[PDB]
């Protein structure tokens, strides 16, 4: 990484202390840049979804890993319905999205909350296994919410077999008066579904999967108790990587976490803590840690530095971070306070490998909490922090719950327009690909190489137009 | 103190221009870090109250004082009245609380209690917040008998049958956390304030005989020749007493008050709670660069500084300590609680609120009395928000206390003094602080 | 009824327009007045749950009747369903109330959803049928909303036999940790659950019940399409009471119901329309039905009044439809427009047998509508009208799509409000509380000592302008 | 009382459904007015504090019962709270004032605080006994007790401050005369007992046994027994009446609430002299909206006030006082006394603690009375409760004192006779003429 001539601040830097200088490009288009990351995740695109219950579910994970990221579970979550996770996402079908299943005998009300789960906007009536007809939101709105499905379902829908080709169904939905193509398995039960921007995105995206080409999912583990137990467990259910994960990342429990996980030799990529230093970036590894996540206080639902003061510019730390794990043969995780794309650009400009997104991602329809809404009728999701499970560990849960960080919240309000995830994926994939040919890199390795950076005073961050 | 690289800064820090750095740590949990401090004050937590009268009461030096910090009490204060206090101070229980209670809101909002006792020559007639429908236990009662008895009033009462205090379910769980400040006779630790104007001698000398376990020699301008003098007066009687004096921000000024025979020196200038003289003045330093040299000076003599002024988040207490101070002084913030001497008023929001005054002149330098009073530092005041739920300071001191020994983990600190030893920290821009979510 | 001297207002009366003239009275307490109602509902506090989707459930059904008042199905419901309803209430304890259910493996968002399913403000963990642990809302704060229960339920409670005295349960409770009290079977099953307002109510309401002892519930039907099936569809499926239901009573479509629905002889109370004249009130009655229920217009979900401008003052409608219907023997239940339990006491003034609520009951827990919150995080729940079901249409089998949108055009659509519950106390109960507190009171006021006295020495006066702003709301 | 001729609506009137018409008058001035009760109550104006514990306390009672007024201490206080309120009233001055207590010693903010329990803008900071000085809202002027509160107001006017800290003749404080103050003792006759001292009453519910409480709260001191409950007409009022009149205290005997004259009648001839009047008007009470039951109170105090004195009777009328047009109308209407409620709750002298609003204005809180006023045991009845309402009566910015209001009050129905031609009360009831009006009528003038 290298800075403009004449910038050395005295300050460790921000993402919006920095910014990016564009310099002499060969590359044509956008789409001509390889997004796919070499940290050994298998994400085709640079994004990771935080562990965390307001973020990281299943639909969330089913969504993301087709599209290219990643989904870490959170941890503390209980092995059986973990196992049942992944089995439900490696079972998912790449091309093709689970919509959001009814029966003919549920109610309106039932139905018109179960819909906003996905971004399809539409749900599909099942009988055993076969759809037997859809039903929209236009379709729920001025009925009876405890009528069920009386008249609601069309039961007229385009329909093709699975596995055809995107470019097709996308054909077929053209002229169709709804957006959603219902797609069957040869034996007549239901694929999935694809919406015409489902199908470009298909084209666009490469999923994230395993050998067998089914979606890739990880899971999360805390340093408390019997680490090596817990990660075997784990392990055996089919996760693709695992995390080790505590507030404070350099620490005595957690390099022995790391080697009580290391010593059952499982093979699986190692991620490791949260340290926003060298030293720290350097002994994790050490530790038998492939990748470590970086960050203290970024967080969004993170009080950490209002509290106990510490923390650190995370830019200043990425960089610091991922240049000790180039040398030691490692990568590193950008975790934490991604408002913008221009902070997944940023970060990978500053060496981080992915970059891990956070509450950000829980405003959207997929995310495991409940829509709620305003008197103003704008949609919107409350996402909270994992509190105590990430930190080290009746009369004493009282005693101790008073001294212990309390869960944090906020709110994250819905794109009015669009409220899907997949829609937050394509402005971050698409500022990025942008980043990289304002820079001129084919890919992220030649991004961190050949990026310019620069500082910036506040009356520089203030430039340009504020998104939506 | 060290410093990242590069980060020798072309200004003076304040508390929002730093933050502090992890390291590695053996230290698992909060529970297993020492707050007690070693500069001789007697608080089992670094925080002392400040000597401001819109904040130390009685009852925020009851309180404050049984969960182990120290209340420094007001000068301008008849000793007729400092006596009273003490003694009330140290005539109560280190685990049990003094209820609000009158003859059968505004009186109910003055402590952190749900509740009101109403009681009849001593006796309890029950409360308010209906006789024998509430909880009652004996004094000697353990916390958690109380606590699971309450399983959020417990009325204490004495052997006679009379009211001796009341203990909530937080107070019953906290008896448990924070070791009470206490004297050599185990009761409660009570500090007193004095000005270098007329006699310090008299005045320090007949605080002592009030029971002041602490004695605070202030003024606004802590260097200068007559608070030498003054120190020289106190110091010269020998009460035994630890001597806090003045306010510098200066490394020669925070030895000169040391030589005068001072133990402990109070740094700061400027960034204040009340205090106007920035915008008066613009005399003043960012706290932070301030306390780090005078911290530094004074281990140097083998002394020790309490750092003073600009303490709003729990952030400040943890830096401060960083920066070498062995305890902090908060004025306004908690001015912002139940158990400060103004009453409880609210405002457009239904949030709550409390109404901070300033010391100004008090802390300063029938003709005479007009004309030197036309000159006096007019009507400090803010407006300090409560916490909608929880309203006390023990609340305050909760999250205090709960970022401080965070701190230590994160840094790999065992007790206060380590924490300045083995700190890492660096500067931030704007944005920087910007970073994490903010406090309710 | 009659009014004071000089009172013969130029216009018809409304709930706010009128006042009860306090008289001498030998009536110690309001514990001493009998609310039991004689039109036949079998209900033993005059009120009645409006039939209505957004208002009556399962849950409403057995709450309400267990406390003495009766729940009236929605019309249009399937019968698969009110048979499954009826089943449901007729089976629940006169007592102990039903629980709500959560698993050890269930998501704290889940439990904390379900909780408010119900005003137990308590949720029972079962372990193979048998009760384990017991959440609380209280139970669940700053914990993550996806943890099991696990770690959040805790197993210290009260026990008791089923079929204990409710007398004992509530001394049970003074010392209890948590005002629940969980109520087993011998055999270690989960019998129910009975709290301390709960054991106090077994007291205070007394059960309304069928010939075997069951919990009664009601249910309706619109006039469209055969009614004679429909009802008598009902009767089987276990309906204790039949309310024949439309928008315009007194027009020939449902006079053809009322008739086709008695020549089957159940052997069940009729209910019959909506009427606000005496005309009205006379011709369903003389077509074979037993009750009248009157009101056009005061409905709070009723868009009547601003589209077409028809409606009548429902004080004015009741005290008019219930003296024709005394004199015919039979009986008027007042229905729409009750916000305070001011307008259930003057309903009952006013002649009415009964007092049928609505949307009100919808800002309630046991409300089938999900619970929601809003801004300043109050709860609240949404209440929808019943619209077309009410109204009458010709016959659609066999439309066209263009005919069955041309119908749609200008049918009526499904009004919406939003109704707040009581942050402290959310149940229908608390409101029952609420009414029969207030109607009592009325009752002690005139020196009734039941309700058909309560009409009959009953002193009326007529206020304006600032007359309804007295007192405080 | 006669309305105007062609108004016979086909409603029962509020005090804003009606309006004084004016007349001839041959009163000059409001002075020559006399506002004196005849119903043997014992105030000098015709002003009553309502019994409720939002309202009086034993500083309201001390304030009023100085300028004219009579307190009813809530009922279903205990005797021993009572006694100790009594003692505190009796033993008060009949012109100087109380003040606030100060000391040297204490803070900027509390003495504010602990102002604010006053109307006197000022409190005396006062060392063992000895006034040392004085705290003036944002040295002293000392007198001697007992002196001429002309001679105290000229002392004052040409003082820098408005008070004046009395001297007893050995040393120190009985209290303290603002220049108001001074000025009120020239207006206001102090309502006084059979021992010299300032006037009180006492409330007692029906329940339970009513003579052997009237007999305690007798000999505790109350010149005026209150037999109060929500509805009067029921026969338990009866026994409670006739029980308490057996006993032969000597006191002047109020009785319940009633709407009717039928009501009035029965409780006049079970043996009270004065009749209660009114059911539903309230601010506190929720009864009209719960039960349904009340009445119009204008035309409550019409119909109660000509049965009463038909028999030889009285009549207070009671609740839905707002403004002194309230008063002077119960009055015109044939009331011996009016009773005011939670509107002086708004007031200084009021035991409910001072907040403050939005707007950085003074409000107090007032609150109902509920049960205490009705007719495992206690929590199957506790269920039944009606809720106590809660209301904000907003302080006046400029005079927060009650004594401020009497001002207002006094000034009104001074003024009404002024109108009407009456030299007094009795004379207000007959030679008034009245009319009635809409909701525009009532708009007209400034509020
Ligand atoms: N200290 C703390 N960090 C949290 C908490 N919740 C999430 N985080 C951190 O914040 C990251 C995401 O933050 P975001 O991207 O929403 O700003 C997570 O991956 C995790 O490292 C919390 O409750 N406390
Ligand atoms: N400079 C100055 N400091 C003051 C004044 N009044 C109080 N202080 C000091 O302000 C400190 C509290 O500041 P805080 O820590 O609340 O920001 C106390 O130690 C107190 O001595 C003042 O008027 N001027
Ligand atoms: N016109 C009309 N009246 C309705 C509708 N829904 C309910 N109602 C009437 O309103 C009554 C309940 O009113 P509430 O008691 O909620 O104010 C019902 O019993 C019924 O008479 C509707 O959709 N349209
Ligand atoms: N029913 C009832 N009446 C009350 C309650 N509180 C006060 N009142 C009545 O209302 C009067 C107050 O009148 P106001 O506050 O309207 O001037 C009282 O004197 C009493 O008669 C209450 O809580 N319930």
Redesign the interface.
Same mark, same amino acid.
């Given at each position: 990484v290298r800075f403009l001539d004449g910038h050395? !601040?005295? *300050?460790? @830097?921000? *993402?919006?202390?920095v910014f990016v200088v564009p310099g002499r490009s060969d590359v044509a288009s956008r789409f001509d840049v390889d997004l796919s990351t070499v940290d050994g995740s298998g994400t085709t695109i640079p994004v990771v979804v935080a562990n965390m &219950?307001?973020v990281a579910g299943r639909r969330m994970a089913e969504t993301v890993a087709r599209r290219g990221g990643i989904v870490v579970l959170?941890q503390?979550? !209980?092995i059986?319905?973990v196992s049942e996770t992944v089995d439900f996402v490696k079972s998912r079908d790449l091309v093709v999205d689970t919509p959001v299943t009814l029966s003919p005998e549920d109610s309106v009300?039932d139905a018109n #909350?179960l819909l906003h789960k996905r971004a399809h906007g539409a749900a599909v009536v099942v009988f055993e296994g076969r759809p037997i007809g859809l039903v929209t939101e236009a379709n729920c709105a001025?009925?009876?919410? +405890? =009528?069920?499905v009386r008249d609601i379902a069309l039961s007229d829908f385009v329909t093709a077999p699975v596995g055809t080709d995107p470019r097709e169904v996308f054909d077929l939905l053209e002229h169709a008066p709804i957006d959603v193509a219902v797609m069957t398995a040869p034996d007549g039960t239901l694929a999935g579904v694809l919406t015409r921007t489902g199908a470009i995105r298909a084209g666009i995206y490469t999923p994230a999967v395993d050998a067998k080409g089914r979606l890739r999912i990880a899971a999360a583990v805390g340093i408390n108790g019997d680490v090596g137990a817990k990660a075997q467990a784990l392990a055996e259910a089919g996760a693709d990587l695992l995390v080790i994960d505590t507030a404070?990342?350099?620490?005595?429990?957690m390099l022995d976490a790391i080697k009580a996980v290391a010593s059952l030799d499982l093979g699986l990529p190692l991620v490791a803590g949260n340290?926003?230093?060298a030293?720290?970036t350097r002994?994790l590894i050490e530790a038998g840690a492939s990748i470590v996540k970086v960050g203290? $206080? !970024? $967080?969004? %639902?993170? &009080? &950490?530095? %209002? %509290?106990?003061?510490?923390?650190?510019?995370?830019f200043s730390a990425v960089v610091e971070c991922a240049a000790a794990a180039r040398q030691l043969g490692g990568h590193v995780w950008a975790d934490g306070?991604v408002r913008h794309p221009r902070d997944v650009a940023l970060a990978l400009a500053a060496g981080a490998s992915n970059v891990m997104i956070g509450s950000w991602f829980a405003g959207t329809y997929e995310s495991?909490?409940?829509l @709620?809404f305003?008197?103003d009728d704008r949609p919107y999701k409350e996402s909270?922090?994992?509190?105590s499970?990430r930190a080290?560990?009746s009369?004493d849960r #009282?005693?101790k719950? @008073? +001294?212990?960080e $309390?869960?944090?919240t906020?709110r994250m309000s819905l794109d009015p327009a669009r409220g899907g995830v997949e829609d937050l994926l394509d402005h971050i994939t698409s500022g990025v690909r942008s980043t990289c040919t304002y820079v001129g890199a084919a890919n992220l390795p030649e991004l961190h190489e050949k990026v310019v950076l620069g500082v910036q005073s =506040?009356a520089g +961050?203030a430039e340009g137009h504020p998104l939506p």
């Open positions: 050395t !601040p005295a *300050y460790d @830097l921000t *993402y919006n202390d &219950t307001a959170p503390d979550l !209980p059986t319905a009300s #909350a001025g009925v009876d919410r +405890f =009528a069920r404070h990342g350099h620490q005595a429990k340290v926003v230093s030293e720290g002994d203290v $206080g !970024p $967080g969004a %639902m993170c &009080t &950490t530095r %209002m %509290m106990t003061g510490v923390g650190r510019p995370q306070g495991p909490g409940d @709620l305003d008197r909270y922090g994992m509190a499970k080290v560990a009369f #009282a005693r719950g @008073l +001294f212990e $309390g869960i944090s906020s =506040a +961050f």
